[PDB]
Enzyme design. Sequence first.
Site, PDB file in Angstrom:
ATOM      1  NE  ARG A  31     114.376 -67.566  34.608  1.00 53.51           N
ATOM      2  CZ  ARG A  31     112.938 -67.335  34.427  1.00 53.51           C
ATOM      3  NH1 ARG A  31     111.782 -66.686  34.190  1.00 53.51           N
ATOM      4  NH2 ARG A  31     111.975 -68.471  34.979  1.00 53.51           N
ATOM      5  CG  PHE A  43     107.074 -64.484  38.376  1.00 53.33           C
ATOM      6  CD1 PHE A  43     106.340 -65.939  39.028  1.00 53.33           C
ATOM      7  CD2 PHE A  43     107.683 -65.195  36.794  1.00 53.33           C
ATOM      8  CE1 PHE A  43     106.386 -66.984  38.170  1.00 53.33           C
ATOM      9  CE2 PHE A  43     107.260 -65.813  36.393  1.00 53.33           C
ATOM     10  CZ  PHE A  43     106.939 -67.487  36.678  1.00 53.33           C
ATOM     11  CD  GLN A  59     114.207 -71.385  36.861  1.00 57.01           C
ATOM     12  OE1 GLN A  59     113.236 -70.008  36.103  1.00 57.01           O
ATOM     13  NE2 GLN A  59     114.479 -72.073  36.059  1.00 57.01           N
ATOM     14  CG  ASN A  98     108.961 -76.912  32.461  1.00 60.11           C
ATOM     15  OD1 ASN A  98     108.963 -76.462  31.643  1.00 60.11           O
ATOM     16  ND2 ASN A  98     108.192 -77.844  32.769  1.00 60.11           N
ATOM     17  CG  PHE A 156     109.450 -71.935  40.089  1.00 61.64           C
ATOM     18  CD1 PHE A 156     109.326 -73.307  39.173  1.00 61.64           C
ATOM     19  CD2 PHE A 156     108.282 -71.650  40.744  1.00 61.64           C
ATOM     20  CE1 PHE A 156     108.728 -73.549  38.698  1.00 61.64           C
ATOM     21  CE2 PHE A 156     107.612 -72.417  40.250  1.00 61.64           C
ATOM     22  CZ  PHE A 156     107.285 -73.241  39.134  1.00 61.64           C
ATOM     23  CG  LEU A 169     103.808 -71.327  36.083  1.00 63.74           C
ATOM     24  CD1 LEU A 169     104.839 -71.149  36.777  1.00 63.74           C
ATOM     25  CD2 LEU A 169     104.499 -70.868  34.829  1.00 63.74           C
ATOM     26  CG  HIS A 211     106.376 -75.246  35.859  1.00 67.25           C
ATOM     27  ND1 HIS A 211     107.809 -74.903  35.073  1.00 67.25           N
ATOM     28  CD2 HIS A 211     106.057 -74.567  34.736  1.00 67.25           C
ATOM     29  CE1 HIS A 211     108.253 -74.534  34.170  1.00 67.25           C
ATOM     30  NE2 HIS A 211     106.838 -74.222  33.975  1.00 67.25           N
TER      31      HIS A 211
HETATM   32  C1  LIG Z   1     108.981 -70.672  36.753  1.00 65.23           C
HETATM   33  C2  LIG Z   1     109.801 -71.377  36.164  1.00 65.23           C
HETATM   34  O1  LIG Z   1     110.295 -71.372  34.992  1.00 65.23           O
HETATM   35  C3  LIG Z   1     110.912 -71.854  33.998  1.00 65.23           C
HETATM   36  O2  LIG Z   1     110.498 -72.901  34.189  1.00 65.23           O
HETATM   37  C4  LIG Z   1     111.458 -70.787  32.805  1.00 65.23           C
HETATM   38  N1  LIG Z   1     112.241 -71.845  32.381  1.00 65.23           N
HETATM   39  C5  LIG Z   1     113.630 -72.447  31.896  1.00 65.23           C
HETATM   40  O3  LIG Z   1     114.690 -71.819  33.112  1.00 65.23           O
HETATM   41  N2  LIG Z   1     114.140 -73.373  31.431  1.00 65.23           N
HETATM   42  C6  LIG Z   1     115.656 -73.649  31.803  1.00 65.23           C
HETATM   43  C7  LIG Z   1     115.987 -75.405  32.065  1.00 65.23           C
HETATM   44  C8  LIG Z   1     115.011 -75.423  33.060  1.00 65.23           C
HETATM   45  C9  LIG Z   1     114.497 -77.085  33.628  1.00 65.23           C
HETATM   46  C10 LIG Z   1     115.701 -78.250  32.776  1.00 65.23           C
HETATM   47  C11 LIG Z   1     116.680 -77.293  31.733  1.00 65.23           C
HETATM   48  C12 LIG Z   1     117.472 -78.342  31.280  1.00 65.23           C
HETATM   49  C13 LIG Z   1     118.742 -77.950  30.586  1.00 65.23           C
HETATM   50  C14 LIG Z   1     119.578 -78.565  29.390  1.00 65.23           C
HETATM   51  N3  LIG Z   1     118.877 -79.633  29.887  1.00 65.23           N
HETATM   52  C15 LIG Z   1     118.150 -80.118  29.613  1.00 65.23           C
HETATM   53  C16 LIG Z   1     117.248 -79.918  30.544  1.00 65.23           C
HETATM   54  N4  LIG Z   1     115.928 -80.736  31.352  1.00 65.23           N
HETATM   55  C17 LIG Z   1     116.053 -76.019  32.050  1.00 65.23           C
END
Ligand SMILES: CCOC(=O)CNC(=O)NCc1cccc(-c2ccncc2N)c1
Length: 164
Positions: free
Chosen positions: A54, A59, A62, A101, A112, A121, A125
């Site tokens: 991603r 921005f 990731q 997260n 990221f 954020l 985060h």
């Molecule tokens: C700019 C950054 O933006 C973000 O963080 C947007 N959120 C994102 O990408 N979430 C997916 C994710 C991100 C981190 C962990 C999980 C996870 C998945 C399944 N089991 C346990 C988990 N801990 C899922």
Amino acid sequence: GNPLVYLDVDANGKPLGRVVLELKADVVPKTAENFRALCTGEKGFGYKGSTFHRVIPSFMCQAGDFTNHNGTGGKSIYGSRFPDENFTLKHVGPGVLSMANAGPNTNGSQFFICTIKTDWLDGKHVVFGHVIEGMDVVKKIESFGSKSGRTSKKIVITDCGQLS
Ligand SMILES: CCOC(=O)CNC(=O)NCc1cccc(-c2ccncc2N)c1
Ligand SMILES: [K+]
């Protein structure tokens, strides 16, 4: 002191160069240690051969979903998830290294690297490091992103580890 680690990144099998990161073990020891060990692969799993899945221009870039390669997977060295350690470090500009997260206390392996200041954020985060070298490499990765987050080339961490 603080670990210095690296990620060697390619785009459709062509090398883009090395990103070197300082991990702030002095402020966030548990979060730093997770990332360090996932770089070395010493626990028997980690980032080597996984992707930036991603990437959003202006921005962030990731990565870290080394199980499903799409944002739904990853795990930490501790278990599936671990707590938010602290929010002492802020998203102060480009080159900040921060945990992705799915809400409070859901850190795994996804992370990221910021390509702008992402201060909205802060407190949500856990920031744990920054780019020491290779912001030009990060900018190359950023170039293969899109506003959707989908990448136009397959962006791969071909190698990774710890320098000191
Ligand atoms: C700019 C950054 O933006 C973000 O963080 C947007 N959120 C994102 O990408 N979430 C997916 C994710 C991100 C981190 C962990 C999980 C996870 C998945 C399944 N089991 C346990 C988990 N801990 C899922
Ligand atoms: K936006």
